[PDB]
């Protein structure tokens, strides 16, 4: 009944895993188009066609820092594209371009009979996430882009108010972020937002990198960005008892977890 389900029920230990269930591949844009390079990431046999979600680093960083969701996402049947921005010191404006830019290409790529992701992604169904400076441009998108179905920025910085966000928005947070810090960014970001569903997902010790490629929490952290995009990107209520159900309920005595702010139930 649902048509945007996809690959089997899920369980505690299948969202904690390293992959999901589907096979992948991924590869290189020719032609970046508005950013500075890509890598797609996608599941060869999705058994449907799948929501695209495009992911940007902070100041300074690289795919590297935020690529571990390509594999992590498109094993859940998704299409990813990592980013690079057209320059490593892009402020969180430019970040939100780039990204916008990055779906619309992938977009046009799925209209591409050359391209491997030719009918694969329903362009329709478009999601948001990032680091830092990124993750303030995820944020951004969501604001500028309301039928965007879900953000999950990580660490996120920005110098915006985001009052009007309707997308469904979680915010990973890094406890001792000295970079971005919670009281300053992700804090005010969170509270600033009465018009969503959200979350704020908040890691115990977290340096400003505790979400980033080879973190030490990237089962719990993989966990909540699945079950979100899941939830919001297919409507699939399949995973909505990890994000407001007992499943939910047993994460919070958690070491990981500092904190856990939600509005649920998400109805």
């Given at each position: 009944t649902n048509p945007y389900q996809r690959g089997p029920d899920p369980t505690v230990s299948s969202l904690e895993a390293t992959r999901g269930p589907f096979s992948t591949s991924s590869f290189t844009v020719s032609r970046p188009s508005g950013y500075g390079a890509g890598t797609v990431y996608y599941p060869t046999n999705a058994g449907g066609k799948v929501g695209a979600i495009a992911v940007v680093p902070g100041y300074t960083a690289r795919q590297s820092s935020i690529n571990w969701w390509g594999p992590r996402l498109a094993s859940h049947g998704f299409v990813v594209i990592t980013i690079d921005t057209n320059s490593?010191?892009?402020?969180?404006?430019?970040?939100?371009?780039?990204?916008?830019?990055?779906?619309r290409q992938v977009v046009s790529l799925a209209g591409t009979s050359s391209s491997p992701i030719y009918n694969k992604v329903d362009t329709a169904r478009l999601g948001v996430m990032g680091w830092s400076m990124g993750g303030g441009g995820s944020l951004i998108s969501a604001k500028n882009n309301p039928s965007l179905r879900a953000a999950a920025p990580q660490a996120p910085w920005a110098q915006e108010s985001f009052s009007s966000v309707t997308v469904p928005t979680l915010i990973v947070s890094c406890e001792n972020d000295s970079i971005a810090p919670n009281s300053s960014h992700s804090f005010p970001f969170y509270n600033q937002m009465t018009r969503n569903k959200k979350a704020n997902l908040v890691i115990n010790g977290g340096s400003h990198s505790c979400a980033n490629s080879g973190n030490s929490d990237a089962g719990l952290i993989g966990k909540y960005g699945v079950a979100w995009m899941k939830r919001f990107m297919d409507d699939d209520t399949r995973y909505s008892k990890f994000l407001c159900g007992a499943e939910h309920q047993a994460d919070l005595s958690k070491r990981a977890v500092e904190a856990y702010k939600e509005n649920c139930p998400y109805l």
């Open positions: 490593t010191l892009d402020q969180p404006s430019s970040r939100s371009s780039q990204q916008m830019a990055a779906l």
